[model samples]
Target chain A: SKVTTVVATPGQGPDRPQEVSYTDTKVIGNGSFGVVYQAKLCDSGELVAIKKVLQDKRFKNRELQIMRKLDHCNIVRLRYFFYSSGEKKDEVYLNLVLDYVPETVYRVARHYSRAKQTLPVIYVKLYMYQLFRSLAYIHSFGICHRDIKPQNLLLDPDTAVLKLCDFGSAKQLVRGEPNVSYICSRYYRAPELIFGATDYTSSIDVWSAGCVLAELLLGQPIFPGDSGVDQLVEIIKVLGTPTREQIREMNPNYTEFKFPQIKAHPWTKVFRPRTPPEAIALCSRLLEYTPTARLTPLEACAHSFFDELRDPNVKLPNGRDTPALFNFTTQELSSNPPLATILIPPHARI
Target chain B: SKVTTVVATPGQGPDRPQEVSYTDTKVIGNGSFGVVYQAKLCDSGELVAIKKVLQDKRFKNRELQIMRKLDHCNIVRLRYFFYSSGEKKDEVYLNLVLDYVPETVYRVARHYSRAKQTLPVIYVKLYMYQLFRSLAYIHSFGICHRDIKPQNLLLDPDTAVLKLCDFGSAKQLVRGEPNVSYICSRYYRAPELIFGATDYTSSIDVWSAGCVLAELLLGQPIFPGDSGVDQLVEIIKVLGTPTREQIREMNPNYTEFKFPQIKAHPWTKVFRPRTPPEAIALCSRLLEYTPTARLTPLEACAHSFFDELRDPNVKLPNGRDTPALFNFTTQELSSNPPLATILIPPHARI
Candidate 1:
């Protein structure tokens, strides 16, 4: 019933400031990072999520800085950002208004799991492929997503389009520039992170994708762990203990393991018998003990597991046409010319 | 087949910029204001009209400046706008990409008129109320739209929503500031303009709306004039010669009349016998000889003729629910607080 107008800069370049108004602002989600409110644009009548974070008014906001540089179909679009005063004098809050995606994989997966049914395999394919595409696009810019989980994945149920969200911990991984080693969720954290490697690359995200893929397949978290050490135990239970070189790479001479060595479970035994070999093969490459041994995001997209997505005739399980999965920008396409040919099939090529 | 992105600012507000892109840029409408291209936004896939106008560059565009300040539900929205370079090195063109409303009052009225029928009386009531609402909101801002015709009134038939558009000739009136006398199309031009009045209020738009109302009622233009002089003759033929006071009010000049006296035409005989008395009464009030004598836009909205719209059971002829007609903002509601009670109705109270 009430409306508020704010002067906001857009999420992208040629960033001109304009006035935008929204109404029906109510807190939809909140965390230590900030609060997110659902609001509808007064003019367009479309719903949006306004993420309001308290600004330090000292150093710049890295999330806003990084979000402005990202332009991709799979990434949630930052519609606008504005500042407002708080109850305290001189206190300011930076509001990030985003395209309101109605659902998330976390919810979608939970619903199916509670119903005692695994999510349809086609959705797993669609969702994971989009995640990889999003990863490839951001990784092309050398931005490492410090957190990658189903909760941060925004989904539009009608179109089945997935958008990567929550850039609070994402950072541009520059050579010789250190970052927080204690990043990402425990269950999805890469093996290098368990050994305290602060100079990790974007490939760390690919390992998280492997866990998401396995979770969708198994109907539960692949590595249900409580702490960094507990997660390493969960990781070794399946993929076996890290070798001396693998330990050396994660952190120099970090082989301080006192637990018994474990052998990697065979990929064929990891899931149901009907599970496709291509999916398991792709997962194996992504969930490697060595970080560099993990498949790059672009390489994962080009893998045979996502080959169905390259087919123009592929439709979602709901009988709707597939989302625009192959509409790659020059930034995503130019990185690997050879993989680009496989990543985009002939039928879908414009 | 191709899409392009640019940082653009919305028509109304602080010039905060955002990234927008569209494809399928095909010409939709072309006129002195330049060409309107129908394009689909890449982000949302919604249709938009991109109006490209060549700019003088040196002089700021009044249309852009005015459009950027308007934010109303009853008005056509200025979605995003950008400037582009022309063929020559120094040539520049300003492009205003706006919300693409599919129908107009002109087309809808003509469809019914050509079918040997009058538009449904209910539609006329709904449309006129919205037009007055738009007028009242704009007039409160002291802006005068010199042009107001059926062609410039956008409509969404399904919801019976009307949006007043084409602000190319609109001016923000400042006290003691003189404006051009020769403006507005002949059919809708106020009598004050015919008398060479340089200073006029937004009531000119009200006069144009009156002519439109009459046209809708008669299923044809009420005063189909052949020329400037002939147009005046058509008006005089119906309403008779202006009184000495009426003439003085328009131009404040001495009379110079060499025309035969004409009796005032009966409003009863102007339209088909089935036309309602309330409609005729409204027309008479709107087409008064003195500008100030005519009812204000809000007053016009509260007229008994539109009381049908205020009823709780009102429905569009198409069986769809009515558009957001009573969702008035505080800015508009505060203009004439007394009229607010009548303009917004009992059932629709927020």
Candidate 2:
């Protein structure tokens, strides 16, 4: 009920630290990393969540560094962060000030699943299109979000603006620099990660995105892998055993691979009959075994499944003109100038 | 009228890059920097301002670098940025998609001034408090927003949420590093900056914030120093000529410190008779001759003038509940522990 104010630094911009006073705070989440508190800012009356984690006095915080470097609407905003010490040891804690987005895709999808219903296809198209766009944005910067799950995808149910959150497992992928392969969530873990690929590219996130899209089409997780062995097994169930070259591409070392061969499942049969053909085609392109074979986030956006979105007549099911789905900047179009022509429908052309 | 969808990166988070499409984009602002377009995000139906500036490919853009790292409610949000090629040659453009805050403090203050009215003290209190909060957050990271003027402070008029913007001159202050002291609007430049002090702290922004507060009180620029010489003339008229100690503190380089002497003007006489004593007191403290003599932003927040804000029963004069003023993170509180006692008023205490 009461408020708390502290001196904190701004995450982005020229550092001109000021006192941030917030109130109505309580723990909203906790994990092996630290505790997250949901609080209200006294001045703006805007709700914010503070992610407080232990800090090592010796080095700079990597999560803080990365979060500060990012600026996008599809990402949760880190408002203000401050540090405090434990009463006894004066141990340091770094609290990240983040905007409070009410729901997560996991919870939203679960709500539908719990009620014996599937998430609407329009919502799926809307969510996945934004997801790939986010992936494309980050991949261009060489940042790999090791954890990509429905839970980490924050949603503002009203706006349907999906922002990617939680960077505890994120890292800027550098060539010749090794990274941990056992990073992302198990269910969405890419095959290369499971195969112990330390030098994996940002493509791992694309694989996880593919799984999420497929999961939405089906009623449950497409690959409910609970263990390392189960991860590849479930993925193989649909895509069949990978060729030897696929394994080598995933990881160069420790090549001892033997898996039972099976025919690839028909993409159409993998989802409900009502599933659109474009969705099936998109899934096939994203879930490839070879890292480079996966579609770039932009390519996924240009896929025909999203044609409904490009239609000037089609809006959100509620008929609110669609959110800024086509607000592409020059950097985005600069990557593929030719795609710009097809990506923006004739009616959407300026 | 038309939509433009491009692959864009999120302004914050683990860098979930995304594709954003928008339509009905028309130039809202055009300046030497470039053109700022007003558009709506089709995915969320949210209004956005796209600032497009020319880029030199050889070096990274300082504004882009700083904007990407900034996240605060009181600061304009940089949603996404992409580079576009110019019409000819190898020209490049940096397009920054920022949250569209429809009002500016400059315009709002001007509105009241035009009618010969003072901004309600409540708004003055609220806006300045938020500005300090923004300043406090940025200063903690060693960033100096070289320009701090009302025109640069964007506002959500419906709620008086003031956000600092236009960081074209912002710099991350480092010890021993030389910077152009020819920064900030003539009226708001710190004495040290005018003294040509290359090595300065973020306090320059603090000084500017002080000037902004003074202007709001008078419903006009208190020190309308349209030229360099006139800048000092305005200050000397109020604070009188600086002493040797104050001059040395500002800068020790040139010894030509002679100036026509003038007696200090009473702070009370500077503002309207109805002006609150506390407002006058805060202004005097902010516009100081010596850089270190000025009160720190947090120190200013804790002053008796803001005690009304600390009260539990206080509400916005407009009848809206206060925004997130007290939502302080640990990073903010980490600077001074003792201040916490007074920062969170007893009535608002948890």
Candidate 3:
């Protein structure tokens, strides 16, 4: 294929523009967020996914700002960004050149589902650990990934590495800011969101991640609701009807809401008898009705469920060493100082 | 630590009695059947399980007669038999020397349950396939195991070999002979047995194996009834209230019995969603309400669920080749001539 070149700006470094070339371009994915193309760089022969979203002429793209600021191994690297003219007059698009990951936790999990098999437990540990690390890094910046589901978790099957991608819905949450409660996908939307709380914290992301963890463990969405109201119903089925105080914790005004009394299902029975207690314990902690009660992403990383990943002898089922999990930055450790000792095993320490 | 010499007769050949020396003997298990000791042969250093049962001086032992007639890789090898005197006057105890395997399907499954993980799908495949093969081998000789469960299935963890053990309740059914309906353990007992059917066939063993398969997939007993009546209720919960014809097939007398109306749970929903369709299909076939509707043990060996075992490239999770699975003798092939081709993969053919 022929090579295409353009003037592009580095995502992280200075705004020094340079010529970039790529070839073998083809659409890999697309939705309301616009088209994503899979292509190869001519110089390095590295594959990349170019996500193109329509740009508003009057304002800076929040996704672009967030991507440029984020640089973590567990987060998909943004190699370059460029502006392109769309087919229509006055139409412009922002193209994000990112590291091309061959798989997603969603697709991998669905593959196992169709084959009538559960994803190996080792994989659940490896992928979820990296996911928590990525969430910890982003949460440290006060950026709440309004959407956190399996589809956004990019995976490199060979290395068992997971990279969190798609920050289009991400926002730098500030205190007292009234944001849209209609955020995140239906199944993963936190209870506070369903109660129409506009003052949600990053704990919303924790709820969504909790759903992802449950799905991976169960091979299906834990709370599969048909509609917005039913989403709460599905949660209520497992978590039981929220108490008066719990409702107030979700949304102060939802205190008078009426729901039939139902007892919470035993967490042990929520999963198969063989599910690790630590995994269930972590999931229960992350999925609390009160947003403030949810575990922070960093605390999730230190949970005993992930202790297997810290073992020096633990290796991928493929016999390869684990992906770089304990390479935590000072900022991440600073978020929860006490967790640093638990998060980084002695063998992983410098 | 001391050598114990005894005159013993080979379980399978002409009864040529010889002196056998064994050392390092200790009790491994015991029950009403008497004590089982773990011992090592002095000459070959091979481990053996010595099952010593009280022998009635007035009659021959049925277990001894049946053990002598059976010989298969999947069935535990009864190497030798001897008689010893108990502390009581003229109290004779028969001792059968059998293969010493380090694990049972029950213990192995429990190990994973404690760790909060399902048995690897590959192991479920290997162990169950070997189990069906063992059943097919014994049923071919008109012998009924009468008892089949995880605890009776011995496992060689390293080789992934499964050996059927325990024939204490075994019987050779002759035409027009009525056997006891009160056989088999509670959980794995067939519906016909619960219905007081004394004229049951080898198909009873198939039902027991089916329960074993479900337990492996579910990580616990599928039908855990509180009592005999509740046992039927448990079966009805999954299989639905058996129809009149179904009840008649189980036991003609049972047809007049009344029970609550219930719908059979969908087999897919009966197991976790990710359970292999083929596995569920196989389980349904073996656990039919009508005894005659169950798949013949040899027919089970040819099911598509076991197709993975026929793949020449398949290896145990430990990276070792599968145990000898398809060494069918003339007698085995004769039992189901049409299935010979399907049971033995091309790569396994000489």
Over the stretch A230-328, how does candidate 2's per-residue lDDT look in tens digits? 456578779987888888888664355355344688888888888889989999999999999999888899999888888888777665776667776
DockQ each: 0.00, 0.01, 0.01
Best-to-worst ranking by lDDT: 3, 1, 2
The TM-scores of all predictions, comma-separated, are 0.50, 0.50, 0.51
How high is the DockQ of candidate 2?
Answer: 0.01
lDDT (Cα, tens digit) per residue for candidate 1, span B1-350: 88888898877667789899788888878654567888999978899888887776357888888877788878888888898985447668888988788899999999988999999899899889899988988888888888888988999867788999888778888866666554576577777776555567788888899999999998998766423344566687677878888877766642543333556888888889999899999999999878889988888998999988888897777787888878887877666788878878988875
Candidate 2 error regions (>4 Å): A1-350, B86-89
Better model by TM-score, 1 or 3? 3
Local distance difference test, each candidate:
0.81, 0.79, 0.84
Candidate 1 per-residue C-alpha lDDT over A1-350 given as tens digits, one digit per residue, 9 for 90 to 100: 99899999998878799999889988888654558889999999999998887777557888899888888889988988989985556678888888888899999999999999898778888899899889989988888887898898989998999999989778899998666554576578787776656568888899899999999888898876433444666777788877788877766635543333556889889888988898899888999988889988878888888877777678887789999877877788656867867876888756
lDDT by residue for model 2 (B136-173), tens: 77776777888888888888867778888877777888
Q: For candidate 3, lDDT tens digit of each residue in A1-350?
A: 78889999999889999899999999999654668999999998889999998786567888999999989988998999999986556678899999899999989999998987889888998888888888888888999988888889999989998999988778999998777554576578788776656688999989989999999888898987433344565687688889888888888766754554447988888998889999899889999998888998998988889988999999888889988988888987778888888988999875
B304-347 per-residue lDDT for model 3 (tens digits): 99999999899987889899999988787667788988988898
Better model by TM-score: candidate 2 vs candidate 3: 3
Alpha-carbon RMSD to native, per candidate: 31.2, 28.8, 20.5
